[PDB]
Design a protein around this ligand. Structure first.
Ligand SMILES: O=[N+]([O-])c1ccc(OP(=O)(O)O)cc1
Length: 158
């Protein structure tokens, strides 16, 4: 689909990943019934009408901590999806920052480790490829914390 994808892509029902242009595209947002946007990039802030935002200023760097944003991202995504609505998670390219948060979400709502969750994302968005630092954070999450996050999900929403 090219290095910034070909348009926003459905990953699971009610969950899409795209680039910054996709996130401003009224036609795509309308077509995909997107009512929530999780913006994770340098300059993230609410932009459009008709959309609930979660904005996480973050760099696409191994020095960027995204683990500390997993819980708020998962809550935001999950509450949207439980209401039958659709969430777009976007970054600059829809390759790394956004992909990482979606992987953490998939890992929490399935029994998948990060590699199986990445496979799931790539099936919908072929350009998905978190930076090697984000891969390490996902590996640590898999080892030490995803089990607690799964239980939290069950307790809060199950
Ligand atoms: O600068 N870059 O090469 C670069 C920037 C952003 C990238 O992906 P993003 O975190 O999804 O926006 C991926 C690569």
């Amino acid at each position: 689909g090219g290095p910034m994808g070909n348009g926003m892509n459905k990953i699971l029902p009610g969950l899409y990943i795209g680039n910054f242009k996709d996130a401003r595209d009224a036609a795509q947002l309308s077509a995909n019934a997107v009512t929530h946007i999780l913006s994770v990039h340098d300059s993230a802030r609410p932009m459009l009408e008709g959309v609930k935002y979660l904005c996480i200023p973050a760099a696409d760097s191994p020095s960027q901590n995204l683990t500390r944003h997993f819980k708020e991202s998962i809550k935001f995504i999950h509450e949207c999806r439980l209401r039958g609505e659709s969430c777009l998670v976007h970054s600059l390219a829809g390759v790394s920052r956004s992909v990482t948060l979606v992987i953490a979400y998939i890992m929490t709502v399935t029994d998948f480790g990060w590699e199986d969750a990445l496979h799931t994302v790539r099936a919908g968005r072929s350009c998905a490829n978190p930076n090697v630092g984000f891969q390490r954070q996902l590996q640590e999450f898999e080892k030490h914390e995803v089990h607690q996050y799964r239980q939290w999900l069950k307790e809060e929403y199950g």
